[PDB]
Amino acid sequence: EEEDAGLVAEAEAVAAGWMLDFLCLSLCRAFRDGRSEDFRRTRNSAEAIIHGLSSLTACQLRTIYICQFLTRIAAGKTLDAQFENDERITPLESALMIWGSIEKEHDKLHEEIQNLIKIQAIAVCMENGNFKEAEEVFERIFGMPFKSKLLMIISQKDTFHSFFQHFSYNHMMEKIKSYVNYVLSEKSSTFLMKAAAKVVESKR
Amino acid sequence: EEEDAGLVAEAEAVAAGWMLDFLCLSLCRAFRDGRSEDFRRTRNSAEAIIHGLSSLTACQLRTIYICQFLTRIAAGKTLDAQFENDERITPLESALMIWGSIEKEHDKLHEEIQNLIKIQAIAVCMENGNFKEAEEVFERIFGMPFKSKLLMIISQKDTFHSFFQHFSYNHMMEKIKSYVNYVLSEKSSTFLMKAAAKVVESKR
Numbered sequence: 001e002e003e004d005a006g007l008v009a010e011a012e013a014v015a016a017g018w019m020l021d022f023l024c025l026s027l028c029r030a031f032r033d034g035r036s037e038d039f040r041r042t043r044n045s046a047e048a049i050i051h052g053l054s055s056l057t058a059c060q061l062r063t064i065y066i067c068q069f070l071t072r073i074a075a076g077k078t079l080d081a082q083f084e085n086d087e088r089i090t091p092l093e094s095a096l097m098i099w100g101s102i103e104k105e106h107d108k109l110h111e112e113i114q115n116l117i118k119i120q121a122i123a124v125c126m127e128n129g130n131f132k133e134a135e136e137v138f139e140r141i142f143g144m145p146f147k148s149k150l151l152m153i154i155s156q157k158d159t160f161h162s163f164f165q166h167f168s169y170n171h172m173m174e175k176i177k178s179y180v181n182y183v184l185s186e187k188s189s190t191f192l193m194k195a196a197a198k199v200v201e202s203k204r
Numbered sequence: 205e206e207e208d209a210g211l212v213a214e215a216e217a218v219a220a221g222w223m224l225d226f227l228c229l230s231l232c233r234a235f236r237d238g239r240s241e242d243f244r245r246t247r248n249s250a251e252a253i254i255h256g257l258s259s260l261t262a263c264q265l266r267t268i269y270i271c272q273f274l275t276r277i278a279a280g281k282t283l284d285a286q287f288e289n290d291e292r293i294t295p296l297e298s299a300l301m302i303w304g305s306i307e308k309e310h311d312k313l314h315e316e317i318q319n320l321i322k323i324q325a326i327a328v329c330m331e332n333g334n335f336k337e338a339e340e341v342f343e344r345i346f347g348m349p350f351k352s353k354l355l356m357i358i359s360q361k362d363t364f365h366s367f368f369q370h371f372s373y374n375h376m377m378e379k380i381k382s383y384v385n386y387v388l389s390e391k392s393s394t395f396l397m398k399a400a401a402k403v404v405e406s407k408r
C-alpha cells in the first residue's frame with residue numbers, strides 16, 4: 001500500500017513529463033502558425049501541468065523556459081502584464097532574461113534574436129508614448145554603436161524612426177519563428193505526439 | 205500542408221483525450237485519499253485540458269461530468285462558490301444535477317448517494333445559520349416521510365439534529381468514495397497510466 005502509492009506517484013510524474021513535452025510542442029506550433037486563441041488555451045494547460053510537477057530534469061527546465069519565453073514574446077506589446085515580482089520589468093525584458101538562461105547553443109541566430117528583443121523592448125515603450133519608461137528599459141538592458149543610436153532615438157522621442165523599421169517587431173517574430181521551427185522538429189518525436197500520430201495514421 | 209495540419213489537429217485531439225482520462229484518474233485518486241492540495245492542482249489541469257478539447261465522445265462527456273461532480277462535492281461546504289449561471293444554486297445542488305445526468309447505472313448505491321446529497325444540501329445551510337436558504341434549497345430539491353422530517357428540522361432550526369448525524373457529511377463522502385473506487389479501477393487501464401506504469405515497473 002505504501003510502495004503501491006510510491007509506484008503510483010512515480011507513474012504520475014512520468015505522465016506529467018509526457019504532458020509537458022506535448023503541450024510545449026503544441027504551444028510552439030500555435031506560436032509559429034499565429035493561432036492566438038489556441039496559443040492562449042495551450043498556455044493555460046502548460047501552466048497548470050507545470051504547477052503539478054513532482055520532479056524536474058535539466059531537459060524539463062529547458063522545456064519550461066521555452067514555454068515561458070514564447071508567452072512573454074506573445075505578450076511583448078502588453079505593457080500592463082507583470083511577469084516578474086519586480087513590477088518594473090516589461091514582458092520583452094523578462095523574455096530577454098529567460099533567453100540568456102536557457103541551456104542552448106549561442107549560435108548567430110541566438111544573438112540576432114537577443115539583439116532584436118533588446119531594440120524592441122525600447123521600441124514598444126516609445127510606441128505607447130512611454131518615453132521615460134523607454135529610458136529606464138534602456139538603462140536596465142544596456143549596461144557602443146548600436147547603444148548610442150538607441151539613446152539618441154529615445155531623447156528625440158523619434159517613435160517611427162527608420163531604425164525600428166529595419167529591426168522591427170515583425171523581424172523579431174520571424175527570427176524567433178526560425179528557432180521555434182527547430183524546437184518543433186526536435187519535439188515532434190516526443191512520446192505522446194508519436195503515439196497520437198500512430199493512432200491517427202492507422203485510421204487513414 | 206493543409207492535410208498535414210489536419211492530421212496534426214487529429215493527433216492533438218487524440219492526445220487531449222488521453223490527458224483528460226489520466227487527469228480524471230488522478231483526480232479520483234486524490235479525492236479518495238483526501239489529498240486536498242493534489243486535488244486542487246489536478247482540478248486546475250483538468251479544467252484547462254477540457255477548455256482546449258477539439259471533439260467530444262459520450263465516454264468523454266461522462267469523464268467530464270465525473271470531474272465536475274467531485275469538484276462540487278469537494279466544495280460542498282463552500283456556500284460562496286457559484287457553479288451555475290443562476291447564482292442561487294449551491295455546490296451540493298449543482299452536484300445533484302450532474303449526478304442525475306451521468307449515463308450510469310441507477311443501482312442502490314446511486315440512490316443512496318443521491319439521497320445523502322439531498323439531505324446534506326439542507327444540512328450545510330443550517331450549519332452556517334442560513335435557515336431561509338435551507339428552506340429554498342428544500343423547495344428546489346423536494347418537488348414523503350423523509351421530506352416531511354426535513355421540513356420539520358428546517359422550521360425548528362434544529363442544526364445539530366440526530367437525523368443529520370445518521371445521514372452525515374462523512375457518510376455522504378464514504379458512499380461517494382465507494383463509487384470513486386469503481387471509477388478508479390475502470391480508468392486504471394487507460395493509455396497514459398498504463399504506459400507510465402510500464403515505464404516505472406521496467407526500472408524496478
Ligand SMILES: COc1ccc(NC(=O)Nc2ccncc2)cc1
Pocket residue numbers: 050053054055056061064065
Ligand atoms: C523557471 O521557472 C520554473 C522553474 C521550475 C519550476 N518548477 C520546479 O522546479 N518544480 C519542481 C518540482 C519537483 N521537484 C523539483 C522541481 C517552475 C517554474
Ligand SMILES: COc1ccc(NC(=O)Nc2ccncc2)cc1
Pocket residue numbers: 254257258259260265268269
Ligand atoms: C458538462 O460540461 C461540459 C460539457 C462539454 C464540454 N465541452 C464540449 O462539449 N466540447 C466540445 C468540443 C468540440 N466538439 C464538441 C464538443 C464542456 C463542459
Ligand SMILES: [Ca+2]
Pocket residue numbers: 079080081
Ligand atoms: Ca506597465
Ligand SMILES: [Ca+2]
Pocket residue numbers: 283284285
Ligand atoms: Ca452563497
